[PDB]
Design an enzyme around this catalytic site. Structure first.
Site, PDB file in Angstrom:
ATOM      1  N   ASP A 194       0.817  -1.199   0.000  1.00  0.00           N
ATOM      2  CA  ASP A 194       0.000   0.000   0.000  1.00  0.00           C
ATOM      3  C   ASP A 194       0.858   1.260   0.000  1.00  0.00           C
ATOM      4  O   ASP A 194       1.385   1.649   1.043  1.00  0.00           O
ATOM      5  CB  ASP A 194      -0.902   0.006   1.236  1.00  0.00           C
ATOM      6  CG  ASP A 194      -1.801   1.215   1.289  1.00  0.00           C
ATOM      7  OD1 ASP A 194      -1.902   1.910   0.260  1.00  0.00           O
ATOM      8  OD2 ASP A 194      -2.416   1.448   2.350  1.00  0.00           O
ATOM      9  N   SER A 233      -0.684  15.630 -11.975  1.00  0.00           N
ATOM     10  CA  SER A 233      -0.909  15.253 -13.355  1.00  0.00           C
ATOM     11  C   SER A 233      -1.136  16.512 -14.189  1.00  0.00           C
ATOM     12  O   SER A 233      -1.666  17.514 -13.690  1.00  0.00           O
ATOM     13  CB  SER A 233      -2.117  14.307 -13.459  1.00  0.00           C
ATOM     14  OG  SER A 233      -2.496  14.061 -14.806  1.00  0.00           O
TER      15      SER A 233
HETATM   16  N1  LIG Z   1      -8.645   2.306   0.627  1.00  0.00           N
HETATM   17  C1  LIG Z   1      -7.381   2.516   1.295  1.00  0.00           C
HETATM   18  C2  LIG Z   1      -7.494   3.700   2.204  1.00  0.00           C
HETATM   19  O1  LIG Z   1      -8.592   4.068   2.613  1.00  0.00           O
HETATM   20  N2  LIG Z   1      -6.300   4.388   2.621  1.00  0.00           N
HETATM   21  N3  LIG Z   1      -6.394   5.454   3.459  1.00  0.00           N
HETATM   22  C3  LIG Z   1      -5.083   5.842   3.929  1.00  0.00           C
HETATM   23  C4  LIG Z   1      -4.991   7.027   4.843  1.00  0.00           C
HETATM   24  C5  LIG Z   1      -5.891   8.069   4.716  1.00  0.00           C
HETATM   25  C6  LIG Z   1      -5.822   9.178   5.551  1.00  0.00           C
HETATM   26  C7  LIG Z   1      -4.839   9.243   6.529  1.00  0.00           C
HETATM   27  O2  LIG Z   1      -4.763  10.334   7.359  1.00  0.00           O
HETATM   28  C8  LIG Z   1      -3.936   8.202   6.665  1.00  0.00           C
HETATM   29  C9  LIG Z   1      -2.954   8.278   7.651  1.00  0.00           C
HETATM   30  C10 LIG Z   1      -2.040   7.259   7.811  1.00  0.00           C
HETATM   31  C11 LIG Z   1      -2.096   6.150   6.987  1.00  0.00           C
HETATM   32  C12 LIG Z   1      -3.075   6.068   6.000  1.00  0.00           C
HETATM   33  C13 LIG Z   1      -4.001   7.085   5.825  1.00  0.00           C
HETATM   34  C14 LIG Z   1      -7.014   1.333   2.154  1.00  0.00           C
HETATM   35  C15 LIG Z   1      -5.733   0.809   2.110  1.00  0.00           C
HETATM   36  C16 LIG Z   1      -5.385  -0.279   2.907  1.00  0.00           C
HETATM   37  C17 LIG Z   1      -6.327  -0.844   3.770  1.00  0.00           C
HETATM   38  C18 LIG Z   1      -7.605  -0.320   3.827  1.00  0.00           C
HETATM   39  C19 LIG Z   1      -7.954   0.765   3.029  1.00  0.00           C
END
Ligand SMILES: N[C@@H](C(=O)N/N=C/c1ccc(O)c2ccccc12)c1ccccc1
Ligand SMILES: N[C@@H](C(=O)N/N=C/c1ccc(O)c2ccccc12)c1ccccc1
Length: 330
Positions: A35, A199
């Site tokens: 990821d 982009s």
């Molecule tokens: N569908 C994505 C996702 O929703 N990622 N979101 C990451 C994220 C968003 C906002 C934040 O503030 C974060 C902070 C630390 C780590 C990740 C995030 C996902 C990836 C892996 C597992 C579940 C869902």
């Protein structure tokens, strides 16, 4: 050093991709979701609430002679899509496709949210965003890539995701046989902890290219392509019967449709996403309404170049002193 591992779609829609990872001694192989939008390496484990495990392979640190509890360390993550997990932390030996890191923080889940439980194919996550996003407390931990970087032949990893087919994650080298033409590199902002880039515009089908700056993140952990409402409306307007459905949660279209391609700009270069990549199948089993692979980012607060976009390219995540991103057609 280098590493190379095959990544495989979890289902017939390419909802996500899993890559085998060896953890511990003797090795325990778990299939992790790599990821680039998060920075925790966490796994289903012998510590995970029993009722929250349903078919996943678990890491059992007590069976690893190299596992060490990281005293007092905990972690808790809430993803943008509403899912979450949390637990404690070990350090252990982790290998991906022949590349080994000793002392890697392996975050052991005590709790996972329902979406994780319900997906038997994903045994955990391997985060590849910047370590500033890592959630371990009170001492933040480094990602697998950050730990490996100094040892790599070149401080890079590449994502080559397949459409309805396996692909490859490489660490430490660029496979010049894996793409066509040249790789176009573009600037990255690391301020928010993501692979954030801009982009240069888009085209719909055979239409003219619209030059316009679209800031977004390269996120292998997100399935779809989330773009501004104007751009998304322009795309779906080319599909007879397509509409935004509040009840379903996005644009849907007749399953009988042939979808147009979508092109995005990387500097002066162009990456073409074939129409078929944008079909995510019936909204519910047996329905003739299909879910679109390009959706509005309005409300997210950020545009997301997820798997729909990334799988149309060979993508270089350049972790040099000043990080950049590279895209090639393939
Ligand atoms: N569908 C994505 C996702 O929703 N990622 N979101 C990451 C994220 C968003 C906002 C934040 O503030 C974060 C902070 C630390 C780590 C990740 C995030 C996902 C990836 C892996 C597992 C579940 C869902
Ligand atoms: C539904 N929202 N998903 C938000 C999301 C998903 C994946 C990411 O990588 C994110 C990153 C930053 C902010 C939100 C998100």
């Amino acid at each position: 050093s280098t590493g190379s591992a095959t990544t495989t779609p979890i289902d017939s829609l390419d909802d996500a991709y899993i890559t085998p990872v060896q953890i511990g001694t003797p090795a325990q192989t778990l299939n992790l979701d790599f990821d680039t939008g998060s920075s925790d390496l966490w796994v289903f484990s012998s510590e995970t609430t029993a009722s929250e495990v349903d078919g996943q392979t678990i890491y059992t640190p007590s069976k690893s002679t190299t596992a060490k509890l990281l005293s007092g360390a905990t972690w808790s993550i809430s993803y943008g899509d509403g899912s979450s997990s949390s637990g404690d932390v070990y350090t252990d030996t982790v290998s991906v496709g022949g590349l080994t890191v000793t002392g890697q923080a392996v975050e052991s889940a005590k709790k996972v949210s329902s979406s994780f439980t319900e997906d038997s194919t994903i045994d955990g996550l391997l985060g590849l965003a910047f370590s500033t996003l890592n959630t371990v407390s009170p001492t933040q931990q480094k990602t697998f890539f950050d730990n490996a970087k100094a040892s790599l032949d070149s401080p890079v990893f590449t994502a080559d995701l397949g459409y309805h087919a396996p692909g490859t994650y490489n660490f430490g080298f660029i496979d010049t046989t894996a793409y066509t033409g040249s790789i176009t590199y573009t600037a990255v902002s690391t301020k928010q902890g993501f692979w954030e880039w801009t982009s240069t515009g888009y085209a719909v089908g055979s239409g003219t290219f619209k030059s316009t700056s679209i800031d977004g993140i390269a996120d292998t952990g997100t399935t779809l392509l989330y773009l501004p409402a104007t751009v998304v409306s322009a795309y779906w307007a080319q599909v007879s019967g397509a509409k935004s459905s509040s009840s379903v949660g996005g644009y849907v279209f007749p399953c009988s449709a042939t979808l147009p391609s979508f092109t995005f700009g990387v500097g002066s270069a162009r990456i073409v996403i074939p129409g078929d990549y944008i079909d995510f199948g019936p909204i519910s089993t047996g329905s003739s309404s299909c879910f679109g692979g390009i959706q509005s980012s309005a409300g997210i607060g950020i545009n997301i170049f997820g798997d729909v976009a990334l799988k149309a390219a060979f993508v270089v995540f350049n972790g040099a002193t000043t990080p950049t991103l590279g895209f090639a057609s393939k």
